[PDB]
Design a protein around this ligand. Structure first.
Ligand SMILES: O=C(NO)c1ccc(CN(Cc2cccnc2)S(=O)(=O)c2ccsc2)cc1
Ligand SMILES: [K+]
Ligand SMILES: [Zn+2]
Length: 357
């Protein structure tokens, strides 16, 4: 049982020319990698080679216009980069951004390929810029191309088109791009937990509410677990996994699990306002490992406290390597509003998943 790891320092080259202290820092990935070395986890993993995605691979999920506009930024002058970035919601661009986004995606393709060909059982991808806010036709929220969505489609392209992929998105934000890309698809089950606040939390759309269950053949294959009015943490996430994520995932019976693993719900994050602990993330990882015969790929999304993300992701890797789940801190009673959220999702998805009845 081998665990793969992909990391390339050159993904640090994407940077904010106006604000060197912008939270989506180059050192997010080097810090996570360093913590893996410090804990002696890196040598326990097989290093998967990084590579650039191709334009044809980007077209699995993105329009030709979007690909061409982002590709063009590699040769843009600063004024062009600033103006282009300001056309999107929450994007900064440098001359290295396009190449870094390609590297994040291609690293994830190689990791999925290593899993699907039986070279490794599971894997972790320490990548930036993130992906889950990127839409077919636009960039958004620090994301240029939807790495996780592209990896699901890439996996299908090297296996069979109907390969069942589960994407679990535990970044504190709703993965609007991932939801939209797969909204009419039953081959990719999208499950997101996210701070919602009745639509007031970024990305500020009611598309993230529990009543969005999918469209067309995808009805039932989009599961939004939105949190309102409360500093959620381990008790709420464990309860959501027990009552919703795991029962639905088991019924779906995925052949590959991708984790959109943002660590911005972590205790200490400057943006998320939540308190999921590193041991909490470890328990979530260990639960997902019971699916798809253990074929799990953990993909870095957001997460902005360098210490928190480094501890949290490195513990997920420890779980993938087979280590025993660490003890959790005392779990307070579920916040009353988290009970309401879980029951609302249960009511919305009981029609589609017999395991919830
Ligand atoms: O991690 C992410 N996605 O997965 C992610 C994180 C941050 C943003 C942009 N921001 C808005 C925001 C507000 C409240 C909660 N979250 C996000 S912002 O940086 O704070 C900002 C501060 C002064 S202007 C803009 C976009 C995406
Ligand atoms: K779907
Ligand atoms: Zn996020």
């Amino acid at each position: 049982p081998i665990t793969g790891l992909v990391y390339d320092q050159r993904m640090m080259l994407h940077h904010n020319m106006w604000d060197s202290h912008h939270p989506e820092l180059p050192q997010r990935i080097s810090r996570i990698f360093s913590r893996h070395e410090e804990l002696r986890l890196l040598s326990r993993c097989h290093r998967i080679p990084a590579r650039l995605a191709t334009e044809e691979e980007l077209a699995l999920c993105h329009s030709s216009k979007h690909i061409s506009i982002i590709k063009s930024s590699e040769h843009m002058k600063p004024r062009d980069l600033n103006r282009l970035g300001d056309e999107y919601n929450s994007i900064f661009i440098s001359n290295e951004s396009y190449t870094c986004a390609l590297l994040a995606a291609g690293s994830c393709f190689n990791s999925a390929q290593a899993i699907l060909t039986g070279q490794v059982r599971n894997a972790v991808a320490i990548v930036r810029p993130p992906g889950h806010h990127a839409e077919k036709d636009t960039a958004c929220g620090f994301c240029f191309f939807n790495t996780a969505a592209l990896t699901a489609r890439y996996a299908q392209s090297i296996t069979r088109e109907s390969l069942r992929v589960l994407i679990v998105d535990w970044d504190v934000h709703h993965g609007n791009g991932t939801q939209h890309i797969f909204e009419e698809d039953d081959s990719v089950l999208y499950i997101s937990l996210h701070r919602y606040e009745d639509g007031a939390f970024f990305p500020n759309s009611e598309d993230a509410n529990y009543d969005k269950v999918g469209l067309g053949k995808g009805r039932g294959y989009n599961v939004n677990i939105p949190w309102n009015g409360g500093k959620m943490g381990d008790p709420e996430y464990m309860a959501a996994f027990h009552h919703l994520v795991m029962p639905i995932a088991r019924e779906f019976a995925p052949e590959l699990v991708l984790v959109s693993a943002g660590f911005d719900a972590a205790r200490g994050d400057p943006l998320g306002g939540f308190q999921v602990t590193p041991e909490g993330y470890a328990h979530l990882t260990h639960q997902l490992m019971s699916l798809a015969a253990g074929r799990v790929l953990i993909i870095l999304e957001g997460g902005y406290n360098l210490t928190s993300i480094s501890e949290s992701m490195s513990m997920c890797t420890s779980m993938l390597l087979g280590d025993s789940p660490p003890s959790l801190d005392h779990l307070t009673p579920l916040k009353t509003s988290a009970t309401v959220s879980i029951n609302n999702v249960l009511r919305a998805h009981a029609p589609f998943w017999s395991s919830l009845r």
